[PDB]
Ligand binder design. Sequence first.
Ligand code: 9EP
Length: 265
Amino acid sequence: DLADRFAELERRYDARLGVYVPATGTTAAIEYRADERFAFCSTFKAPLVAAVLHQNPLTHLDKLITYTSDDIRSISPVAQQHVQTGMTIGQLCDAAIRYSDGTAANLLLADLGGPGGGTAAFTGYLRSLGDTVSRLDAEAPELNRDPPGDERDTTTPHAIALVLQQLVLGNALPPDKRALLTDWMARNTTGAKRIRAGFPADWKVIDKTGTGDYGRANDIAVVWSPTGVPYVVAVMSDRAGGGYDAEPREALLAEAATCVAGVLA
Ligand SMILES: *C(=O)[C@@H](NC(=O)Cc1cccs1)[C@@H]1NC(C(=O)O)=C(COC(C)=O)CS1
């Protein structure tokens, strides 16, 4: 029984686990704690890039953005290396998705603009996709740090799955922008030990991870069966019982995804 298996994983990892897979053709929705709030962590970067793409002509990707020492405030694998030269919006989108680059995400929030350094416009973009649940209140690093239970900077597995479904599978974006987002997620470098680890090699996986304090580890993905049937998979987790410095545990997400893949095969 799937709920029993997820509960077992919670005990194993001293964790809270949330899972959502939207209903399809012939599969019922898979849901476990799916309407409970979990921190976005870096998973917000996927709809953030969608927001920036949606808001601008495609060639806005070629605009150079400059930034300085005091902008580097978080893990930023790419932005730290290009600080002397600047990065185009396209490079920033690439880095935010594929390297979960915090500086890139903050610069993209600022590009979107408006109150809260772009966080209000980001939330407004989610509202436009019918998500009345999620909220972004802070940028990097702060957004990963809210105490367990705090609603700031949270989504739910259910809400983020429906958002990702519209972005990648639905018509939230025009085909050209949809393809840019899909390809960046397809080329993600940070997700090998999460949802990807739970699906057989002949299934395509594209994803965006998130990791935070209190043992937070998330992954949102679109997967395609060997025959081209797509599913959206959102797995979120925290280990609040270990306090702020609790280790995130990717293996929890890999096991949860393995359980999901078993049902979807
Ligand atoms: C987004 O989740 C962001 N997280 C943080 O900046 C907070 C943390 C820093 C170290 C551990 S949590 C970036 N994204 C990811 C990710 O998986 O998407 C990170 C993953 O790190 C580990 C550990 O697996 C950290 S940086």
